[PDB]
Design a protein around this ligand. Structure first.
Ligand code: NA
Length: 164
């Protein structure tokens, strides 16, 4: 039942590779389905053509603000925001896929892929998947970040979709 989706990512127009993510529809179906549909674009909008705007080495790579491209925007397939579904899944290490937010019950479209264990985010950010393949691509993304989050190159999700 768990979708496999993919992100194809470049830096300054140069492809970095493909990240494959499992979405834990068995634990957080509402959150998984939001991300799944934003990968396919089947609601008429989604991640394709948007950026990793905030990338912090030894922390995480954040993306999904396809409206403002700076961390202030994005929207879910349900509306602008939707509640925290649950906090069952934990930030157990590199490769965890989790919802960015602006506090309780503010999930939109922004998400992050961890590059370390970010356990202090447990109970505050909804984990909804993990990297199946392409953690080397995530590390390439991470290499273009900074401790401030600002990236040294424009990191673009050139394509995305569902594999199964
Ligand atoms: Na720190």
């Amino acid at each position: 039942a768990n979708p496999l989706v993919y992100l194809d990512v470049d830096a300054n127009g140069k492809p970095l590779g493909r990240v494959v993510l499992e979405l834990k529809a068995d634990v957080v179906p509402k959150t998984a389905e939001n991300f799944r549909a934003l990968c396919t674009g089947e609601k008429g909008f989604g991640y394709k053509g948007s950026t990793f705007h905030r990338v912090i080495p030894s922390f995480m790579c954040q993306a999904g603000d396809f409206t403002n491209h700076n961390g202030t925007g994005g929207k879910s397939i349900y509306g602008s925001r939707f509640p925290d579904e649950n906090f069952t899944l934990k930030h157990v290490g590199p490769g965890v896929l989790s919802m960015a937010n602006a506090g309780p019950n503010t999930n939109g479209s922004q998400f992050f892929i961890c590059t370390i264990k970010t356990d202090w985010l447990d109970g505050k950010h909804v984990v909804f998947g993990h990297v199946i393949e392409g953690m080397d691509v995530v590390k390439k993304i991470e290499s273009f970040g900074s401790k401030s989050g600002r990236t040294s190159k424009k990191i673009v999700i050139t394509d995305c979709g569902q594999l199964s």
